Amino acid sequence: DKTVRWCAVSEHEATKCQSFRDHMKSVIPSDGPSVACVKKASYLDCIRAIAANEADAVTLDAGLVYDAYLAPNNLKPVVAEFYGSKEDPQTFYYAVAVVKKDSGFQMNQLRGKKSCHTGLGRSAGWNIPIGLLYCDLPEPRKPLEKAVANFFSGSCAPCADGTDFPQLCQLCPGCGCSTLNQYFGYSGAFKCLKDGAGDVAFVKHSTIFENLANKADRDQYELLCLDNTRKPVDEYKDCHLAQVPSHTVVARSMGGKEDLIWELLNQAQEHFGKDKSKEFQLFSSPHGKDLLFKDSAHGFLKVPPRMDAKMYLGYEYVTAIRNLREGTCPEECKPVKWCALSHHERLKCDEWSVNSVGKIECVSAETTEDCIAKIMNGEADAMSLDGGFVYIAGKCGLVPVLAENYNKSDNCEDTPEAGYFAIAVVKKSASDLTWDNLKGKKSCHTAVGRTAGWNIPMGLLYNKINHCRFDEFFSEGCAPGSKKDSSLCKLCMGSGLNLCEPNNKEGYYGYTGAFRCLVEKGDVAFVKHQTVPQNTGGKNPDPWAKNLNEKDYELLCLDGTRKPVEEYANCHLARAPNHAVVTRKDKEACVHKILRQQQHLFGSNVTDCSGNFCLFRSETKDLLFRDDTVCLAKLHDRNTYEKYLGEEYVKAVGNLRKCSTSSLLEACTFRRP
Ligand SMILES: [Fe+3]
Ligand SMILES: [Fe+3]
């Protein structure tokens, strides 16, 4: 159709929208995008109209971005307003709790303090902090402003009924909803803090930088962090209540026309964005402020497709809003929801769950990235990950809690390992094959984004050839998780929709699968140093592996040589950080504790994995954990993805950034670049 039906709320917005259509029809050719204008009564009416295909697009505050996500509207964010520059565009703000340096209290000591709020019902100054504190408030919690006044010893809460809740105006008597109140709004809440009236202001991070000249000033303040520590205000990205999108174009989740919407708004900012045209302005109006888009906006960015509303708002924001909206609280550790990679893993997890005495629960997802996304948003808590996805999870905010260890040791739990080895395996009867001409040969990979399967060897290949078209360097291959039309899906063996999927419905997914792919169709397999021994000499009983001999396979060396499989130490491509379990920072304590308990009960201490449950039970498919996992090891100081993986591997993965096809990585780096 190529017509975007924008939704306006007021006669003013509908006027501006019509002007927007007219000026676009004058500069965009007939084959370009256009606008149509639908006037509805409220942001809520616009949300429904988009859901019912009566409209297409509307820009929303974060609070309505949440509501628009809920059943039955199922809208999603598709285009973002930004507010800085094209070289540093500021799509999100950060709700922060700013205090005076050295005032002697943490987040869990806020009760009986004096609080400075921007306004009653506002976002960063109320709904977010009060949302996060909701269960800390004293029952009865409705009405909210009474529970809040019984929480803080006194406040400034502009726009609140003073007569009803008089403790809420101690710092601004009467609680002026106008800016005649000196502590009204963002700058006024911060003056309430700077002035000594309150002990904490709930403001945006940018409120601090625009009310303090230099860093020496900002050093006089600190931020309250959710882990009950303080950090400097400059460290707001690592110390905030929530990340909030400033203004979000939303659309239908299927058939929403996001690409048309983006082309419409991309073309619009070129012609009519900040300082582009004297004839028309997207970001102002002679009919009123903030019509359709914010007058402060400098342009638009496309929201990465993997993003849904929960991911976009962030976990912390959703938690706070859930609490206030639902108006209901919950009453040891929570049992850990493990995310299983499809039904092959879901079965082993279920046996784990029933034998765990209630401490492990299971969720499923069809890809690793989908699982990481459930852990991010709270639908799950933990899983083990190849280092390549440890990297991505960290980019997405998750943290490693325990490592898989593979070396036999009298003290495995407490002995860091240096890593395994990424190797290129070939068939010895193919004597020609050399690391210096795989060009046009056929490749087998554990999965896109995995360390030995992909990051290491494609890292090296991208240095040699300096383009990312790996499916054209190889004639064909199997790299589960590639684009379905890729020649790196051709050698895969899954049936139907399972072909090339990065789960065990694709028999070539994983270390064993990449090796099977080599035996059966390909010329080179990128796997770990242990994989050929694990599947030869009868150790793997399946018909394809039964008769394979270790000696029939060889390792390609970096120097162009070839050694046997047992000689990986002098003939590998790189070290590979062990696989690790990841979770949210708020589940790190419980997951570290629960897993160490579980592996005492079902780890490598176990005699006869036939009689009892065995979390690391050596089957073929590395279900949940790698089949050669000896124990889960403590991480000590190496507890971010950078520290756990090490500078080495991180610059390795980083060098591949331009080639990345990970939709989840693009989504998380959009929320934190
Ligand atoms: Fe606001
Ligand atoms: Fe791996």
Swiss-Prot record:
Residue positions binding hydrogencarbonate 1: 118, 122, 124-125
Keyword Glycoprotein: yes
GO cellular component, one term: recycling endosome
Keyword Repeat attributed: yes
GO-annotated biological processes: antibacterial humoral response; cellular response to iron ion; intracellular iron ion homeostasis; iron ion transport; multicellular organismal-level iron ion homeostasis; osteoclast differentiation; positive regulation of proteasomal ubiquitin-dependent protein catabolic process; positive regulation of receptor-mediated endocytosis
SS bond list: 7-46, 17-37, 116-192, 135-329, 156-172, 159-177, 169-175, 225-239, 333-590, 339-371, 349-362, 396-668, 412-631, 444-517, 468-659, 478-492, 489-500, 557-571, 609-614
Principal location listed in the UniProt entry: secreted
Binding site for Fe(3+) 2: 386, 420, 511, 579
Keywords attached to this entry: Disease variant, Disulfide bond, Glycoprotein, Ion transport, Iron, Iron transport, Metal-binding, Methylation, Phosphoprotein, Repeat, Secreted, Signal, Transport
One Pfam family it belongs to: Transferrin
Subcellular location: Secreted
PROSITE patterns listed in its UniProt record: TRANSFERRIN_LIKE_1, TRANSFERRIN_LIKE_2, TRANSFERRIN_LIKE_3, TRANSFERRIN_LIKE_4
Example GO molecular function: iron chaperone activity
Residues with glycosylation annotation: 30, 407, 466, 605
Domain Transferrin-like intervals: 4-326, 336-658
Residue positions binding hydrogencarbonate 2: 446, 450, 452-453
Chain positions recorded as Fe(3+) 1 binding sites: 61, 93, 186, 247
Main function: Transferrins are iron binding transport proteins which can bind two Fe(3+) ions in association with the binding of an anion, usually bicarbonate. It is responsible for the transport of iron from sites of absorption and heme degradation to those of storage and utilization. Serum transferrin may also have a further role in stimulating cell proliferation. (Microbial infection) Serves as an iron source for Neisseria species, which capture the protein and extract its iron for their own use.
Family: Belongs to the transferrin family.
Written domain comment of the UniProt record: Has a bilobed structure, each lobe binds a single Fe(3+) ion. Does not always bind 2 Fe(3+) ions.
This protein's name: Serotransferrin
Source species of the chain: Homo sapiens
Lineage: Eukaryota, Metazoa, Chordata, Craniata, Vertebrata
Name of the coding gene: TF
